[PDB]
Design a protein around this ligand. Structure first.
Ligand code: HEM
Ligand code: HEM
Ligand SMILES: *[C@@H]1O[C@H](CO)[C@@H](O)[C@H](O)[C@H]1NC(C)=O
Ligand SMILES: *[C@@H]1O[C@H](CO)[C@@H](O)[C@H](O)[C@H]1NC(C)=O
Ligand SMILES: *[C@@H]1O[C@H](CO)[C@@H](O)[C@H](O)[C@H]1NC(C)=O
Ligand SMILES: *[C@@H]1O[C@H](CO)[C@@H](O)[C@H](O)[C@H]1NC(C)=O
Ligand SMILES: *[C@@H]1O[C@H](CO)[C@@H](O)[C@H](O)[C@H]1NC(C)=O
Ligand SMILES: CCCCCCCCCCCC
Ligand SMILES: CCCCCCCCCCCC
Ligand SMILES: CCCCCCCCCCCC
Ligand SMILES: [Mg+2]
Ligand SMILES: [Mg+2]
Lengths: 240, 240
């Protein structure tokens, strides 16, 4: 059914739509999603995320339908549409700059330094390192971004994203909440599945029951606190 | 051309899905949407709203994709899913009870009394009557529902809904912001297009540019103020 050898990595061209999400960009760069990054529906995302990563429909339907709000189309997006600030896209990203003081769309190596340097002395990233990175990235946004938004919702989304890189890029059981640095680094820096380096699609389904306790533990270890508004309101569509 | 003779009203059966929205219920009762009220996509809503009412894609795409959040499916809903409180469904409805103190799903004649009795001495409802109804419905919820939610967002949705019945059920130019009581009453009470009573689909497109000034004027005349935190956060999916 799914043949990874028939899904080679190819660099996106200059008119291939790419977004702020390394998960979806990586699927597109391997043809699990359309390589042009356009006309993508939630069914397409569900199937691509299952085939590529063994991520289940529960989280992809929930996230996907929120992502659909970022376009002007009835049932599709471009991947670039997802950069719409305050729908899903948030400050204190792991690999992108805050929209008020920089580029909220493209991989940025200087931002990524915090993650790349985390968990000193080990060859994996794990739940405690992930939490430390989140704490540090939010401190960076509070220090440098006069428009910073930090809410219960953005904090949960951020922990979700960390749980994603820990699980989808895992070597063994994604339950363990740890992933080889060499796999995660390739994922973010090149938006490529690190097949050559020894990565394989998880044989364990990654769903909400699995991710939940990981998300909550990342949040707990990150020493997160409310800083201001705390209204979990999302942007419901472009140009409002 | 649209043939309404090909789209007769039929009462919903006991396992036909129906929701809190008279607009979409009415389209289903005429087969513009599936009579069973199930497996409804945003494209289906766009086409049905155009064919039945001359409502354009701008508002239906925006509202439709928010409505999709209420189901567990990738790109469809059942009409009943739309009852999900705090996505679109709100307190101080025109024809339904608040969820905390009653049934937020079915037409309720006692609630509907306020609208049915508005604009005394005219045979139309109009912008000032619609505003008075909204003021009175909200006051009712504030008096009887200690859990009332009333925010910039719910207030905008409410004025949008009033603008819809004023425009879609109009006799002449929907621009005028007035509709025969005999048409509107059938719309709410029977969820039927009042063809027998003389109604015809608008020949003027109903879109955001047309609705916007009507919405804003209803709001202005309604002497509205927020309740509590005024947080415009929506519920992003069922069972959270
Ligand atoms: C419905 C599916 C998905 C949608 C709509 C989606 C959307 C997004 C968006 C909008 C962001 C930017 C958040 C920000 O940093 O400001 C993002 C980030 C991220 N997504 Fe996805 N995503 C989805 C699925 C996935 C999958 C399957 C993975 C797999 C690992 C993933 C991993 C990530 C990671 C690691 C980030 C963090 C990037 C950063 O902080 O620099 N996502 N996602
Ligand atoms: C197509 C034209 C539409 C018309 C004419 C229309 C009309 C209305 C009206 C008049 C109400 C208020 C009922 C009341 O307060 O008792 C209402 C409520 C509602 N409509 Fe629609 N609607 C339309 C489209 C939509 C769409 C596309 C969605 C979502 C996909 C939607 C979802 C709802 C919901 C959830 C409510 C419940 C709000 C509440 O009263 O608590 N409607 N609609
Ligand atoms: C998107 O894909 C659908 C089939 O899934 C196709 O009919 C449609 O034309 C495509 N959209 C565009 C704009 O190319
Ligand atoms: C993460 O790895 C570091 C270094 O190996 C270790 O000290 C720490 O206990 C680990 N944390 C978790 C949650 O496994
Ligand atoms: C961001 O903050 C600055 C300085 O506090 C202020 O001038 C500006 O209005 C803010 N911009 C936004 C996006 O609200
Ligand atoms: C609505 O109708 C009433 C009675 O005919 C009238 O007094 C009122 O001015 C009308 N308002 C608008 C906005 O047309
Ligand atoms: C109403 O709000 C209060 C807030 O103090 C809360 O305790 C209660 O559970 C709410 N009731 C309902 C019906 O949810
Ligand atoms: C990209 C993160 C997923 C966004 C989905 C919003 C709902 C809350 C977070 C998902 C896990 C609880
Ligand atoms: C008939 C009820 C739906 C119409 C209005 C919904 C608009 C969605 C939210 C956008 C900001 C108000
Ligand atoms: C959210 C969809 C309905 C919006 C209509 C209310 C305001 C219209 C004019 C305001 C200018 C931005
Ligand atoms: Mg970001
Ligand atoms: Mg209601």
């Amino acid at each position: 059914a799914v043949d990874f050898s028939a899904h080679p990595w190819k660099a996106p061209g200059p008119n291939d739509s790419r977004g702020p999400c390394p998960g979806l960009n990586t699927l597109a760069n391997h043809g699990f999603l359309p390589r042009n990054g356009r006309n993508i529906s939630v069914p397409m995302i569900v199937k691509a995320g299952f085939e590529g990563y063994n991520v289940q429909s529960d989280i992809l339907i929930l996230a996907g339908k929120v992502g659909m709000l970022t376009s002007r189309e009835a049932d599709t997006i471009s991947l670039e549409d997802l950069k719409l600030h305050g729908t899903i896209e948030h400050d204190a990203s792991l690999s992108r700059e805050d929209v008020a003081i920089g580029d909220n769309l493209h991989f940025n190596e200087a931002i990524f330094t915090t993650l790349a340097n985390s968990n000193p002395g080990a060859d994996v990233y794990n739940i405690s390192s992930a939490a430390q990175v989140q704490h540090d990235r939010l401190a960076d946004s509070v220090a440098r971004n006069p428009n910073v938004t930090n809410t219960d919702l953005t904090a949960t989304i951020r922990s979700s994203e960390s749980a994603f890189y820990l699980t989808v890029m895992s070597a063994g059981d994604p339950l363990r909440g740890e992933a080889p640095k060499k796999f995660v680094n390739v994922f973010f820096q090149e938006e490529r599945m690190p097949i050559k380096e020894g990565w394989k699609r998880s044989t364990t389904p990654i769903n909400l029951p699995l991710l939940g306790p990981i998300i909550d533990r990342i949040t707990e270890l990150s020493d997160w606190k409310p800083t201001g508004d705390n209204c979990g309101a999302i942007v419901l569509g472009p140009g409002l």
